[PDB]
Amino acid sequence: PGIVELPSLEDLKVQEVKVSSSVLKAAAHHYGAQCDKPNKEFMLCRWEEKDPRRCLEEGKLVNQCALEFFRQIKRHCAEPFTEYWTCIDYSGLQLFRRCRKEQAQFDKCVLDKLGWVRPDLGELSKVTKVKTDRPLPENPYHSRARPEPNPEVEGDLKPARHGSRLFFWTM
Amino acid sequence: AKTLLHQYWDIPEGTECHRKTYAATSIGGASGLVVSAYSVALKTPTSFLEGVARTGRYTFTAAAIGAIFGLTSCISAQVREKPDDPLNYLIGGCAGGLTLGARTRSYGIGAAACAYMGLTAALVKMGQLEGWKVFAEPKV
Amino acid sequence: MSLVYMNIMMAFTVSLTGLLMYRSHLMSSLLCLEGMMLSLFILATLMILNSHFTLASMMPIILLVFAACEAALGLSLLVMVSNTYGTDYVQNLNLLQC
Amino acid sequence: PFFDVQKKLGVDLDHWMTIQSAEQPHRIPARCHAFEKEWIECAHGIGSIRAEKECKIEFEDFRECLLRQKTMKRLNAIKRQRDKLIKEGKYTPPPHHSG
Amino acid sequence: MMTYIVFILSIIFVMGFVGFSSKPSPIYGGLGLIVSGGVGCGIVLNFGGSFLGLMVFLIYLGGMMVVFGYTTAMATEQYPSNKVVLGTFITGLLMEFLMVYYVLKDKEVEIVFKFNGMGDWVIYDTGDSGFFSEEAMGIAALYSYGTWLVIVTGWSLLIGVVVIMEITRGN
Amino acid sequence: MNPIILIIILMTVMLGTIIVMISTHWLLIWIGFEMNMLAIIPIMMKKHNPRATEASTKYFLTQSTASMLLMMAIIINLMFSGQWTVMKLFNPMASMLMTMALAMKLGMAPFHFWVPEVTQGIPLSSGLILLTWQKLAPMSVLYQILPSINLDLILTLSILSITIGGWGGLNQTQLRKIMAYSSIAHMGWMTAVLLYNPTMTLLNLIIYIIMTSTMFTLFMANSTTTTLSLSHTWNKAPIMTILVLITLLSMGGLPPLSGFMPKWMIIQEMTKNDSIILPTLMAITALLNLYFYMRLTYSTALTMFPSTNNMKMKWQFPTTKRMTLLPTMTVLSTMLLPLTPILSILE
Amino acid sequence: MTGRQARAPLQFLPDEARSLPPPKLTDPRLAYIGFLGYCSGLIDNAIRRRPVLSAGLHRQFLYITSFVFVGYYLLKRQDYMYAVRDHDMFSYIKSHPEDFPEKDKKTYREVFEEFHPVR
Amino acid sequence: MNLMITLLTNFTLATLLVTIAFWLPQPFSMKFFLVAITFLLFDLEIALLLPLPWASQTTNLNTMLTMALLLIFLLAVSLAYEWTQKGLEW
């Protein structure tokens, strides 16, 4: 019946953050601190419309925000950020209690030289308001109307009309 | 099954003949296989050749009754030229009962089978002629 | 249609015919009942996994434990029949004629 | 008969094992959540006969979400066509990983 | 060693069901049901299958066939193959060969269905954020929501205990 | 046997049947059927004769394979549109397997081969409780899942069960086999009108349960297996004879008596549809299954067989059996004729 | 006929059942039930060898009381069921005038029916 | 299939060990049955118990404690019943 409406290859070209996984995992909390403020726009778009191919401008926005954040952490202290994530890389699944002293070192670098207090637990939680520019959608479950209501039977009941109205045993 | 009984009753009766007798032989073969399947399940013939013999006898007799019913159906419908009566299938059921008694080789069973199969066949055509539904409305 | 479901339904018919036709020992009949149980277990479990039917995923293990204690009752009945007789054949049961 | 002590005592002790979209112990959906919500809202105040003859479109949408029969039929037709045209040899395929 | 490994393990599964539905001696039957349960464990672990297929393995291949072989050892003798057993095994192998041949070289095989015939890498998850192996948290219910179900299950097992002792000479 | 253990087993039969009545989940219905089986097995083999052992073996095998085929039907129901709500099903094949499962659960014509064999080698109490609760437990389920059944299933099983419980039944003087073939014929009746108005089915269930309780209570009042023992009961006591007369005639269903009321209402709300030849066939077979009732009455209370002394000895002892509740059930079962508009007490 | 607001659970007598007229004192149906209870006590004397019409008078009074009580409750439920059936019938009459047309009364000055004499 | 590779290597090397070890040199009691069924029923109750360490992180903790104690309590009642009622005696 109906055909989909796919986006073009012109919107499918954002400078992708082709970084690896352990550095992205170790660089998560301060990325939650400085950036990740305008991507709850994207989160609210994704949970008010269950439809990617629509919220992709905000996906490009979080892509450029994360690339800008890694640019800003690339230009300044630390270069031993590289030492910190390669200290945490080869430890299986990356427990954050593994390389703790260099975590303190990177925190002291970024604090005494740039700012960016680390989010204490549990501040990557605690349900957060977000305002947007687009108005909130209605009925994204694209369906028809609720077809028929049952007429609700009410009214005070009469007694029996001439008994059982079976063969006999009248009244 | 519904497909082959529908093929039997779909023929105008009427004369579109020998398809009637082929469908009636198919009915007879099916019913003989049913009853012979119950019998070979509930007897343990020992040997298996006896089981094949009993199933062949049941299928052969039921197919013979169906064939003779269809033959005198077609002949009576062509001769009388009145396709609405049940009397022609009364003749049909009595002929089928007589040949049932012939293939079991006793005559009182053939007489009672003539009477009962004639009455049931007249009732079947008569109920098809008026219109009495299979097993249900099922509405109210 | 997730093609494997056809094979597991055909496996159910295999176990059901093995439950129905059975020659000598009641233990083979009870073990094919257990095989039928395993068939229902596996079939429903693959369905619930591919559905992401994650709330009521209790069906495999609870179907399993109930029909397992059914098989336990069957073992006790077969032991009682084999205790009051010599063997546990389908024969030597032709008493109490219908 | 079917009785209604389930509704009478006010203990809804058995209505949670029943459908999807009742609240899972961690708030996750199933695979066909929204199809269920619109189907249940289609056939709620309904005497189960105009449910048969009126909510048919959304019910077929829900059924084809649940089993994905004809979508797999379309994908299988695409696979068989792809096999016979690569058997032919026209356009040694750039649908895999490169041009 | 390739894609249709779920289908091939299903072939060995139905072969095992035929292999003890041919009615051998019941210790060969227990062997056939053990092999069938192992490859059924293989099938459900191929769907993953993280808990339930290793869970059946302790019960049927851990607690049920043990007592089936036990009762084979203590009750029946069968002291010495046959025409009927191996002939039914041949006809079962023939029926499976015919069905899978018509699955292979045709579109679909219909008992009264439409089984869309190809191996099942479809359907599957599109790489969701599972994070808890949804079987695990599903069965990690039954103690919050599961009031009635585990109560009647345990009650049935208790009544099973008193039933077994009564038939085996209560008290 | 301990009396505490018997009270426990009765509690579990009641628990299983109430779980079948009350639940809305399919697993719980299957649990109720299985627990009903597991509890009802040691009510049989109440003695230790091998007759009850073989009867319990046959019963367990048929009951367990019926339970597992029911589970097959439910897992087919979730192979199609899948939810655990006792409602309209979503497959003619699943409904076919499910109604054949329940037809194995309760006494039907292809499946009745275990019923006289399970009733012959057991005492009277086990037969009473198995007939009552094992013909009460599937009727609730069929009353639930009626709106998605191919009618030819139910109607074929009903017709064939009425005529098998008729024709098989002219040959046995084993009273348990007589009552079992009567159970087959009445379960055919009580299943027949499932798709038209199930109020008739449940009222017929009430009437049949009360009638069979009266009949088995009269047999428990004086232990008999044959009709000659009933002629000795004629010699020893006269009021049991007129009770056998009234209860056998109310199993026969005659219009002055209360056993006719379930037949007549079935014929009414069956013939308000276009079904007429099927009522007259069913009621001809209802005339058929009265004949063994009638020769039983001729053996008991109307002609008189020659008696044996030591009935002279049994004269000196007045009766000392306890009845559970015989007279209340009797006059509830037989004088209920002018209370036909207690039809609508049910729905 | 089916429930018809089983939603709204079993409810042996609804709270809308206190609008119908109740069954009166000494109505003949519960008089029949009391006669059946008297006969039940009499046959209860008759099963064992205790003498009829005597030495069981408390059991006579008990069976009369219990059966008249149970019959009274069932008479109230019966009257309610017939009342709700009649009100639902008239509600479906008034709900759709389109399918139950008024038969205009063809009086017998113009209605033609043949004779067919029996000689 | 990685653990299937391990299973295949162990199975093949074990068959190599066995076949190279072989080509080279050339009534009953009820008391036996009660313990096995007691194992079976208590093992099924173990199967009901064992998802307890999965469950201990929810927002309904008192109820979980109550029903977990109910499961072990029922298991203890079954144990003490067959203990007192000569179920395991000699």
mmCIF file of C-alpha atoms in Angstrom, chain B residues 2-140:
data_model
loop_
_atom_site.group_PDB
_atom_site.id
_atom_site.type_symbol
_atom_site.label_atom_id
_atom_site.label_comp_id
_atom_site.label_asym_id
_atom_site.label_seq_id
_atom_site.Cartn_x
_atom_site.Cartn_y
_atom_site.Cartn_z
ATOM 1 C CA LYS B 2 -17.027 -31.920 1.547
ATOM 2 C CA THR B 3 -15.332 -31.605 -1.850
ATOM 3 C CA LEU B 4 -16.530 -34.916 -3.275
ATOM 4 C CA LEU B 5 -19.996 -34.815 -1.724
ATOM 5 C CA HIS B 6 -20.240 -31.309 -3.202
ATOM 6 C CA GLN B 7 -19.152 -32.787 -6.537
ATOM 7 C CA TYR B 8 -21.932 -35.353 -6.212
ATOM 8 C CA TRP B 9 -24.683 -32.888 -5.351
ATOM 9 C CA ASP B 10 -23.483 -30.222 -7.804
ATOM 10 C CA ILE B 11 -24.618 -32.393 -10.724
ATOM 11 C CA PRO B 12 -28.154 -31.531 -11.889
ATOM 12 C CA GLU B 13 -30.197 -34.681 -11.390
ATOM 13 C CA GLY B 14 -31.104 -34.226 -14.242
ATOM 14 C CA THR B 15 -28.802 -36.218 -16.494
ATOM 15 C CA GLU B 16 -25.083 -35.452 -16.752
ATOM 16 C CA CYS B 17 -24.535 -39.076 -16.358
ATOM 17 C CA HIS B 18 -21.742 -41.544 -15.367
ATOM 18 C CA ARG B 19 -20.021 -38.744 -13.480
ATOM 19 C CA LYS B 20 -22.739 -39.485 -10.933
ATOM 20 C CA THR B 21 -21.697 -43.125 -10.810
ATOM 21 C CA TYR B 22 -18.001 -42.222 -10.606
ATOM 22 C CA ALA B 23 -18.669 -39.863 -7.690
ATOM 23 C CA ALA B 24 -20.823 -42.506 -6.003
ATOM 24 C CA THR B 25 -18.030 -45.065 -6.337
ATOM 25 C CA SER B 26 -15.657 -42.519 -4.794
ATOM 26 C CA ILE B 27 -18.091 -42.081 -1.873
ATOM 27 C CA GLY B 28 -18.269 -45.857 -1.508
ATOM 28 C CA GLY B 29 -14.496 -46.276 -1.555
ATOM 29 C CA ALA B 30 -14.055 -43.555 1.061
ATOM 30 C CA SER B 31 -16.718 -44.942 3.411
ATOM 31 C CA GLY B 32 -15.408 -48.481 3.010
ATOM 32 C CA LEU B 33 -11.911 -47.279 3.873
ATOM 33 C CA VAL B 34 -13.279 -45.509 6.990
ATOM 34 C CA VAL B 35 -15.159 -48.498 8.386
ATOM 35 C CA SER B 36 -12.405 -50.912 7.382
ATOM 36 C CA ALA B 37 -9.865 -48.689 9.144
ATOM 37 C CA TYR B 38 -11.840 -48.944 12.385
ATOM 38 C CA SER B 39 -12.187 -52.702 11.905
ATOM 39 C CA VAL B 40 -8.486 -53.307 11.223
ATOM 40 C CA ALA B 41 -7.699 -51.118 14.224
ATOM 41 C CA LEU B 42 -10.027 -53.130 16.472
ATOM 42 C CA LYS B 43 -9.398 -56.715 15.396
ATOM 43 C CA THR B 44 -5.631 -57.471 14.943
ATOM 44 C CA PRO B 45 -6.184 -59.817 11.961
ATOM 45 C CA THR B 46 -2.895 -61.889 12.212
ATOM 46 C CA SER B 47 -2.037 -62.373 9.442
ATOM 47 C CA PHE B 48 -1.819 -59.033 7.679
ATOM 48 C CA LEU B 49 -3.098 -60.627 4.465
ATOM 49 C CA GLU B 50 -6.382 -61.187 6.300
ATOM 50 C CA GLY B 51 -6.406 -57.500 7.217
ATOM 51 C CA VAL B 52 -5.905 -56.461 3.598
ATOM 52 C CA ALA B 53 -8.633 -58.951 2.629
ATOM 53 C CA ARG B 54 -11.123 -57.504 5.128
ATOM 54 C CA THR B 55 -10.389 -53.914 4.090
ATOM 55 C CA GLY B 56 -10.721 -54.879 0.437
ATOM 56 C CA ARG B 57 -14.036 -56.592 1.151
ATOM 57 C CA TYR B 58 -15.423 -53.565 2.996
ATOM 58 C CA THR B 59 -14.267 -51.056 0.357
ATOM 59 C CA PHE B 60 -15.498 -53.322 -2.446
ATOM 60 C CA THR B 61 -18.960 -53.773 -0.941
ATOM 61 C CA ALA B 62 -19.451 -50.086 -0.129
ATOM 62 C CA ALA B 63 -18.242 -49.083 -3.600
ATOM 63 C CA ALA B 64 -20.600 -51.656 -5.132
ATOM 64 C CA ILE B 65 -23.573 -50.230 -3.218
ATOM 65 C CA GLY B 66 -22.606 -46.720 -4.318
ATOM 66 C CA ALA B 67 -22.227 -47.816 -7.946
ATOM 67 C CA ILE B 68 -25.578 -49.606 -8.093
ATOM 68 C CA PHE B 69 -27.291 -46.673 -6.358
ATOM 69 C CA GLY B 70 -25.855 -44.271 -8.932
ATOM 70 C CA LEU B 71 -26.709 -46.541 -11.876
ATOM 71 C CA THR B 72 -30.381 -46.904 -11.045
ATOM 72 C CA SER B 73 -30.453 -43.212 -10.064
ATOM 73 C CA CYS B 74 -29.310 -42.252 -13.567
ATOM 74 C CA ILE B 75 -31.573 -44.794 -15.281
ATOM 75 C CA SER B 76 -34.706 -43.830 -13.326
ATOM 76 C CA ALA B 77 -34.006 -40.123 -13.864
ATOM 77 C CA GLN B 78 -33.634 -40.638 -17.614
ATOM 78 C CA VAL B 79 -36.683 -42.896 -17.959
ATOM 79 C CA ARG B 80 -39.235 -41.183 -15.710
ATOM 80 C CA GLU B 81 -38.179 -37.673 -16.905
ATOM 81 C CA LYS B 82 -39.360 -36.243 -13.565
ATOM 82 C CA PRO B 83 -36.269 -35.237 -11.568
ATOM 83 C CA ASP B 84 -38.151 -34.032 -8.466
ATOM 84 C CA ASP B 85 -39.555 -37.196 -6.865
ATOM 85 C CA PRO B 86 -37.820 -39.203 -4.146
ATOM 86 C CA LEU B 87 -39.418 -42.399 -5.510
ATOM 87 C CA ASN B 88 -36.541 -42.892 -7.938
ATOM 88 C CA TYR B 89 -34.068 -42.853 -5.074
ATOM 89 C CA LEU B 90 -36.429 -45.099 -3.111
ATOM 90 C CA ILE B 91 -35.821 -47.567 -5.941
ATOM 91 C CA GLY B 92 -32.144 -46.668 -5.565
ATOM 92 C CA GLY B 93 -31.930 -47.478 -1.873
ATOM 93 C CA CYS B 94 -33.839 -50.725 -2.321
ATOM 94 C CA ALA B 95 -31.500 -51.793 -5.137
ATOM 95 C CA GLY B 96 -28.485 -50.960 -2.985
ATOM 96 C CA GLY B 97 -29.916 -52.945 -0.095
ATOM 97 C CA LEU B 98 -30.662 -55.931 -2.332
ATOM 98 C CA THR B 99 -27.110 -55.996 -3.630
ATOM 99 C CA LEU B 100 -25.754 -55.590 -0.094
ATOM 100 C CA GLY B 101 -27.719 -58.734 0.719
ATOM 101 C CA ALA B 102 -26.329 -60.289 -2.449
ATOM 102 C CA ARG B 103 -22.705 -59.621 -1.503
ATOM 103 C CA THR B 104 -23.207 -60.876 2.050
ATOM 104 C CA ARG B 105 -25.132 -63.880 0.601
ATOM 105 C CA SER B 106 -28.193 -63.832 2.855
ATOM 106 C CA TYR B 107 -31.636 -62.639 1.873
ATOM 107 C CA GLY B 108 -33.364 -61.348 5.013
ATOM 108 C CA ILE B 109 -30.534 -58.858 5.521
ATOM 109 C CA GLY B 110 -31.067 -57.859 1.897
ATOM 110 C CA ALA B 111 -34.784 -57.306 2.476
ATOM 111 C CA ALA B 112 -34.322 -55.191 5.609
ATOM 112 C CA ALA B 113 -31.505 -53.319 3.885
ATOM 113 C CA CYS B 114 -33.805 -52.649 0.905
ATOM 114 C CA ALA B 115 -36.423 -51.172 3.234
ATOM 115 C CA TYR B 116 -34.118 -49.042 5.384
ATOM 116 C CA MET B 117 -31.753 -47.860 2.632
ATOM 117 C CA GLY B 118 -34.724 -46.973 0.423
ATOM 118 C CA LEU B 119 -36.311 -44.937 3.205
ATOM 119 C CA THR B 120 -33.041 -43.157 3.996
ATOM 120 C CA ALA B 121 -32.287 -42.393 0.335
ATOM 121 C CA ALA B 122 -35.795 -41.038 -0.256
ATOM 122 C CA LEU B 123 -35.349 -38.883 2.852
ATOM 123 C CA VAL B 124 -31.934 -37.638 1.685
ATOM 124 C CA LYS B 125 -33.195 -36.551 -1.737
ATOM 125 C CA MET B 126 -36.383 -35.214 -0.170
ATOM 126 C CA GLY B 127 -34.458 -33.096 2.317
ATOM 127 C CA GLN B 128 -32.205 -31.833 -0.437
ATOM 128 C CA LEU B 129 -35.322 -31.022 -2.462
ATOM 129 C CA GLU B 130 -36.958 -28.968 0.268
ATOM 130 C CA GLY B 131 -33.722 -27.770 1.859
ATOM 131 C CA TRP B 132 -32.690 -28.890 5.342
ATOM 132 C CA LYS B 133 -29.306 -27.582 6.401
ATOM 133 C CA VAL B 134 -26.341 -29.709 7.432
ATOM 134 C CA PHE B 135 -26.126 -29.957 11.234
ATOM 135 C CA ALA B 136 -26.954 -26.356 12.138
ATOM 136 C CA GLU B 137 -28.373 -22.995 11.395
ATOM 137 C CA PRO B 138 -26.190 -22.255 13.762
ATOM 138 C CA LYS B 139 -27.849 -18.882 14.438
ATOM 139 C CA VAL B 140 -31.073 -18.303 16.358
#
